Write a protein that binds this ligand. Sequence first.
Ligand code: IUM
Ligand code: IUM
Ligand code: IUM
Ligand code: IUM
Ligand code: IUM
Ligand code: IUM
Ligand code: IUM
Ligand SMILES: [Ca+2]
Ligand SMILES: [Ca+2]
Ligand SMILES: [Ca+2]
Ligand SMILES: [Ca+2]
Ligand SMILES: [Zn+2]
Length: 287
Amino acid sequence: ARHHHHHHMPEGKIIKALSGFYYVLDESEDSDKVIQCRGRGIFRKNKITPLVGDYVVYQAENDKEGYLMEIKERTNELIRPPICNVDQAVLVFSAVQPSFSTALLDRFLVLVEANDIQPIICITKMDLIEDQDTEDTIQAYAEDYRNIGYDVYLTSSKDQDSLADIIPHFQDKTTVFAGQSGVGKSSLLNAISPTRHVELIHTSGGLVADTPGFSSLEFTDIEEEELGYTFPDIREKSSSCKFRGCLHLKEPKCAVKQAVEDGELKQYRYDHYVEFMTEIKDRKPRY
Ligand code: IUM
Ligand code: IUM
Ligand code: IUM
Ligand code: IUM
Ligand code: IUM
Ligand code: IUM
Ligand code: IUM
Ligand SMILES: [Ca+2]
Ligand SMILES: [Ca+2]
Ligand SMILES: [Ca+2]
Ligand SMILES: [Ca+2]
Ligand SMILES: [Zn+2]
């Protein structure tokens, strides 16, 4: 028979943090159990605030609140919402209503990439396209981003609500939704179907944040030499640039610029790179 279950140091993930308690999901036993914990019974001197998404060691006894013992090193941390250890971001945009913008997509991609997160791309409202030229343009963009190496899912509004092709990605990951406010929120609600503080919702074998990420798109923490790494296409071509640390702006014998000339890198990707570079540089005085 089962006895003394509570005399070990189990591990779990913080899925909710509210009013002085931390709710820890523990999948490591036949049970799916959520344990209400205080952060205080050990974990100091160590003033670090626990965050939703933290991987923790905790202790808990029968019919008593638990206590966080140790917070594991964080792989990443978002500021708004305050969450950490995020594996993936589903970036949701509309094909029409409003018209799809590679500029907007590329900005979100940079932010996700710069936070050590894997982007997944979702273009919805495909059902609202009547013009064949509009359909062809969106299919071409989708193939472009697939060729860069992203997963790209084209969905109808009242259909994508099912999230059929996205759901498989949730398993054993922590995921956030971001992108356009309208479609991003509606897709997210669809995902987690059966200010407030963010929670992770346990669904389809993984965790999904109940608040959109990346609500502000400033590049404040990104430096000029770091930007190219967030464009996998530019990043890979940068190996062939003559000068080391080439920023792919006015340098001669730049492989990135040559690739754009040849059609090996999309013109719009490079155009956005240069635009974002300018924005980064404009933070500071120039000499
Ligand atoms: O996974 U990293 O820098
Ligand atoms: O996960 U890395 O370069
Ligand atoms: O997920 U990336 O370069
Ligand atoms: O996950 U990466 O370069
Ligand atoms: O997943 U990658 O470069
Ligand atoms: O899997 U790769 O660049
Ligand atoms: O998995 U890779 O760069
Ligand atoms: Ca622009
Ligand atoms: Ca896929
Ligand atoms: Ca709740
Ligand atoms: Ca590389
Ligand atoms: Zn270059």
